[PDB]
Fold this protein.
Amino acid sequence: VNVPSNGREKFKKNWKFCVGTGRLGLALQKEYLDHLKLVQEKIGFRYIRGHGLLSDDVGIYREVEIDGEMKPFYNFTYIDRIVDSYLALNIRPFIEFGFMPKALASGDQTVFYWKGNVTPPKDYNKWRDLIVAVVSHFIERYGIEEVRTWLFEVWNEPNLVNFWKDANKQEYFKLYEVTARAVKSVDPHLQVGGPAICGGSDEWITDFLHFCAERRVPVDFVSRHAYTSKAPHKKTFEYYYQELEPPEDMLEQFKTVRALIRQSPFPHLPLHITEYNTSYSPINPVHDTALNAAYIARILSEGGDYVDSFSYWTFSDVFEEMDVPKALFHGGFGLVALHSIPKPTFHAFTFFNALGDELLYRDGEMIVTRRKDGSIAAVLWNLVMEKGEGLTKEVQLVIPVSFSAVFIKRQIVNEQYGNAWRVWKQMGRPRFPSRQAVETLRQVAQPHVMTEQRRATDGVIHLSIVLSKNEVTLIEIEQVRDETSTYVGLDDGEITSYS
Amino acid sequence: VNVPSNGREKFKKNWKFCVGTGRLGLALQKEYLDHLKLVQEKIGFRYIRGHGLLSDDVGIYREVEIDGEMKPFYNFTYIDRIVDSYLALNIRPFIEFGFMPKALASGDQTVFYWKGNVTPPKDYNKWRDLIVAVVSHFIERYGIEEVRTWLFEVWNEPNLVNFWKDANKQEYFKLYEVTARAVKSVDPHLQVGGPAICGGSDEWITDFLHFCAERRVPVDFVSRHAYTSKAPHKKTFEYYYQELEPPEDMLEQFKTVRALIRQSPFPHLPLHITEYNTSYSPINPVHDTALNAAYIARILSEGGDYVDSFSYWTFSDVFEEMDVPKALFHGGFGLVALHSIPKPTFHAFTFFNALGDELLYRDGEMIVTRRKDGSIAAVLWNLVMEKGEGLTKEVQLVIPVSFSAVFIKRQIVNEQYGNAWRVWKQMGRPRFPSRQAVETLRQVAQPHVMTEQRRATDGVIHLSIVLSKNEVTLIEIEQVRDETSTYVGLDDGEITSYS
Amino acid sequence: VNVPSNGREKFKKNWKFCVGTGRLGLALQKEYLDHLKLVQEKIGFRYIRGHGLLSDDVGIYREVEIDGEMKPFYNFTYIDRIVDSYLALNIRPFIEFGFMPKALASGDQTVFYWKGNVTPPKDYNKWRDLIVAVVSHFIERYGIEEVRTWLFEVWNEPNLVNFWKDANKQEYFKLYEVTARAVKSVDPHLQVGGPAICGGSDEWITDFLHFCAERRVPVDFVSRHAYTSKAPHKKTFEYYYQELEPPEDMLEQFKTVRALIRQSPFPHLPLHITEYNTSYSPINPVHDTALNAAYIARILSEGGDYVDSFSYWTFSDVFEEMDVPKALFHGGFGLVALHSIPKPTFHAFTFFNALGDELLYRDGEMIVTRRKDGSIAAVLWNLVMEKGEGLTKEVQLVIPVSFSAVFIKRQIVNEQYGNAWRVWKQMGRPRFPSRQAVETLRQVAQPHVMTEQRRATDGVIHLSIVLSKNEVTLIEIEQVRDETSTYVGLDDGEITSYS
Amino acid sequence: VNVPSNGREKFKKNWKFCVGTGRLGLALQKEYLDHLKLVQEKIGFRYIRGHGLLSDDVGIYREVEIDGEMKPFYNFTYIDRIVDSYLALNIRPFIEFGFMPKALASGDQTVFYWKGNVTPPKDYNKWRDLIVAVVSHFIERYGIEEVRTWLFEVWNEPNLVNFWKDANKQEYFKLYEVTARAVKSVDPHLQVGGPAICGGSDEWITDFLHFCAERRVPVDFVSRHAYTSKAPHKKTFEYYYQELEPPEDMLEQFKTVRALIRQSPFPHLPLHITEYNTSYSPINPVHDTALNAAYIARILSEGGDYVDSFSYWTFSDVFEEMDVPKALFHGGFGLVALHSIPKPTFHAFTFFNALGDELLYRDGEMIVTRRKDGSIAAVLWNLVMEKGEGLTKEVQLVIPVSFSAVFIKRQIVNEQYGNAWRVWKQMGRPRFPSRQAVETLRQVAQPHVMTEQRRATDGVIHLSIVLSKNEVTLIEIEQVRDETSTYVGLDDGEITSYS
């Protein structure tokens, strides 16, 4: 690999525009907030996207007896706490309107352990009035300027019978239109969008856009979900195990959908992938592994070519769709495990966070960039999906260099380093680990670091990087400005045992 | 090495009774308080011992004109702050009375960059009144029960001309007596001692105790310093380099001094080694190295056999005896470097801090203990003082183990791992590193961790441990209570690329 | 009032043995843990008592299909997190076993907005096994010594139909026996008790204790709830308004239940009042008022003469029994309001917290104590239950004192000071106030401080104290050790405008 | 007083552009950083200005033996920590080059307890190289863009014999030229100024600018100091008492100086008052008083009309020009006393910090502003320099109000409230107070808060404000948007003892 000294294109920040979260009511938890702080220190997402804003634990919508009439009462006690805590961590709501508040619901169908109601409202004017009240309260508390930077998606996965009664397309379009007109009636520059579908039903997007064009309904972006797992071939009381398609299958989804939009009546609409991961199940052990990290590295590297954002589902294991987690590593979606133990996928994100803007080189296994200070940062990955026992990959890089000498820092996560899941197993898989076992897992969960000085002969540094199975590695290369001549008389040979 | 299953002897906590510090005026620094918090978190010393309580930066003794007379004014502003901050970190003062305030000094001779005055008081009754005022202030602010746990040392190294005018033996005995009687006069339980002498003239200890015997002077303990370095053979504007004697020569020092006490009129006096380190210079690079940590490990394993406490000089590179530090790694005495970067010797101490009470085995290269919960903890070291390179040892441990499933955690510091000084050289030795260079040094300064599960064939576990040159390693061996049978149907072979 | 100079009687610490809380699942909230940290810093309770350990949000009990059979699974994820957080704040669980896990319930009846199921177990042996699993877990994680210090209550208000199917007395006695015997089977030193009833059916206490004697069921203490409000006479969509009885009526309940126990077959059983407040409704505005503070002071004053502990319901407005709070001050039981604004009652507890052990004087309006350092601390209160108006009381304290000069610090909470509820109404009663309005309510919630120096004649000081309507006041009287003579030449008359 | 409803003119933020500090070596103290954090939370200065950057405790300039010769060595260890800590608290240095490093000094004369050397350099080329090295290291560590916003002042009070050998004007101009030219040679955009003189010799400012015009020396700003105390009429071993000129005398200094600049060859140069206070002594008790707050308030109100910044000397009592402070309140210059106890003057600044941009009305006793949200903020003060008793002013504000219901919040500091000095005296003036005595003084140091709701009468609200002797008060008036009609059924009459 010959690395050009100059780039020309920029590597975009789309890969960290948004991250997913479990339902909004869980943001009230201290553990959730510990994990969000860690994520915002080490990664720094701009937006956060989750379900349940209008569900009943957050508690917004209630019907109250004042005399002999039921009247709506809007309780903002919890979401004011929640959004306050988001803004204090420099992250903003990617608002999702749903699910259906009980008192508004037209039927009983629910989804998840927490039972979000998945039926249309029994009265669409009550629904619009809910939407207007919530958007006006955001603007009252946080100001119009702030709330214009937010994003507003309507519903979640309406194409699926588990998420929306009868996967009724035309009723979803009615809910979309009522919600998007209500939002635009409070302020015309609020950004609203949909339809938030998952894969294998892309005509919904084309029908959605034809609907909004004909009926002149505002849409400011398209959203869609992307996963690559197949239906489980094995279930346990605890787990689903699923086969995964390769990362190219996911990147082909992004590209397919973008092509749908280009042929539509809104050819230039932003595309936001509002959930993605390998597996769509929150109890698939693959999410805890180094495989998951190496898999997601190619998405981070190329995803931004096709989409305006892609939101990893999720930043943390604080999640209740299938009940409270039953062991420390339980197959959860999170970048961060309970107790703030980063998983291998967490490090993939912090690695991409060290990259510069200027893109020098990219292929299917690496990306090489240049920073403002002139130094070079590269992330390399070795995704290996087969059962094999010794599938290393040598990469030789040839980096041009005017300096005399260079300092190289390399960080690695793989099946051996930065991998707390493997140590948790050597521990006997404790479900509810002691505080001491947890301190050990935190120590072990950190990337392996290696350093060297290298002299740069004939303008060039030669780097041969061996990548073990499912390794992701960051390599940073900086100019040594050597101060050693300043230490007049210095001689390590004068220290007992040295040089 | 076949490790017994039962102990008989305890391993004493003497090795962390006390640690040394730069002069007390430096405890006002935020950086000093940062390193102290780090050390108290990971090691947990009981006492802290430094110079300069009565020197002029701390400000206690002034003369002021009142009613046409020079009268003493005792300013407690700074040592109230200093001692309040020690008690907040659970550490107590091992109080050293010195050096001589300027307004009390009889002559002009000083020591150190900060100019402690090293001459007797112009008036011994003024000195006694100072001592009484200081001790009584301590009782008023902290209460008698707290202050009775502190210890009181008189002066420092009065056998060296640098530290006491003319190294005047009889003048020192006189200062001692006035000081000791002053302290006892405030409260009979306050423990006072001396003569705080360095190596090379232990006739001072026998004479000091003869003087106390004959003049009926209180003495509650004997204090002595120990170093193993020869006078410097090479000096730079920045460094002293010195040859070192092997660690046995320091343990002979402890033993010899203990013999001299047992031969004296006070045969049961506690012995405190109130400073020790390899080199007595605060500008000798050996202190920054893994050599220093392997050398110190031998001392921590056996020093407690001969003495009641031995105080490592010092917990921190916050130090000014030879002027402000001129580079990050400058030969300082500290366990912790500036920016709270732990040196190799810091880890030697945190490793001994994981050892249990019950001593199962000790030789010149390892110590093996058992904890209350039944786990085994061992520290091993490979000290190599020659310039060689081919001095990697191999150790075979046979450890009895009632369990049958074992989790082994190992931590390593050596020339490669946990070693910031080496990476600092790879960086070009920055004198004044950037924030990012400092964050990198903090990561690389962490011990390397390795873990495994092992089955215990025959109720014993055979470990073979390779120790590289000047490695110190902690090995912890704990019972697995395996929970994997409760994961009914678990099969990592069903995860893509896995078992 | 002449205050005796020496005491004889001790003022017990019983008043802060225990506090109440909202259901345990709420302890996962960051807001809860902020309020708890504030209460533990300023008051420092030993135990905390709440409902829902076994209810389904905490998630302990699940039935899971293990290939062929429905088997129990015990998920400790959440209560380990919760009990870890209590022990880090130095507070211990007063464990209440309840309510009924949905998967164990024999019928459908529930209580509260969070739906605790209130029916007996379908299988008493499954219940027993739940209990043994939970207690054994606590021991494994925290150790027997720690767990022996906790207390274990069985269910809650089983004499009320809303709390227990049919208020069925014999069914409750059976659940008790099964739970008590299960706890004793794990460890015999664990303390278990009941019946946790409210007022108005004290034959339950005599029947419970007769049941336990006849069947030799272990009982280690008796618990009882006490309130003085009548049933609501006015309801709003948001409030219950209730008339109160005077505080003597509550003290008469304490005394009465103690009398029942002394005539029982267990005449020496500890009595724990496991809940008390003025009103039993979490939506009665009286709880936010200065009236409530003056009413409770009387109880803190004397309650401990009759009972071993009395647990204020509750430490915080973080509470959901009647749904999420609909305004800042909404009649909540808490000492601390949302945003960690202390209500008037909080300050009544902080004031009793400045009292010494030595009891000098007490009557129905004041308590006077002497501290170990010799200083005097008194709390005085002017409870006025009538609609009256400028109802101002005068007290004259003749306080014996050897000193000669005294420093007096007085802190006042009343309808004017330390009263955020009154300022909140001045603000227009914002339901969901902005951050700036909150910082204001926090300022205004602080007690008013007044101070003076008084010269005290005849070993005696004369204190005349005006108390406004529903005022609570702390007065502290300290010896002045005057340092003014040391400021030779001081003259405030030499400062412009001063003396 | 009739306040107009509209403004046109803006009240500028000049009053908080810069604040003074004790010598830069003190910034290493934890206590200094505590006080700076408090000041930055509640006031928020942009720059900070102190002495001793080039003095020997900060340690930059050293001469070192390298082989035969004495070479310069620049030690940046300490100022890097210091400047890092400033920028972490969002405050930037107003760099002052001085005093003279010992090893560059041409003579022995020193100033202050800490002995800053006050003589010209022995070689002006070494000085230049010092200045070039310091400025280049700043740009290396912090970047040119950050450093371009800093200001660089040369020396301090060179017109005073105590500050500059012989008060030699031409040696000063020569030092200025060398320093100004060295700063520009590193980067021409850097802002350099002088001559940093105290009052009573403004001919120095005209000779200074005549010198710069004729010799073509860069000057980017003029600097000068302002004080109004006369020579001490009474001295104590610990105090100077001084008569104070009225506040107009200081505003007339500012206005006089700005007129000198306008008539000079550089008519558009910024004027920075780099130190001001009432007394120039750091042991004058007037600084701890409410008089000092009321005095300074007139300056904050108008000073900005004449000068670009005016820097209160100083933010904190962490100071050592006249030795360590001998008591809690010792007449020090600071806004914040030791233990982070705000003095009354601290509150004058936080009160001005509540003011809005738009100026409505200002006279010699008050200033009234409007904020962006429409609310009104006023600071009023009652400066009384004579010794009388009841010296109360009454002010009647008639406020134009577009509202209809108004919430009014007043904060008060005077001889009774917000005044820890008065209470410290009632305590017997403890020199070195306990932790409890300090906690009491911190409570008492808080401003007194009063609130009310007021109905706006015909378009207007009438306010009558009674100001006691030396009061400073903030009054904020905000629209009540009343939520009470939302509380359908609410009746405080239903709460026992209420409406």
Summary: Chain A has two domains: 1-11+357-479, 12-356.
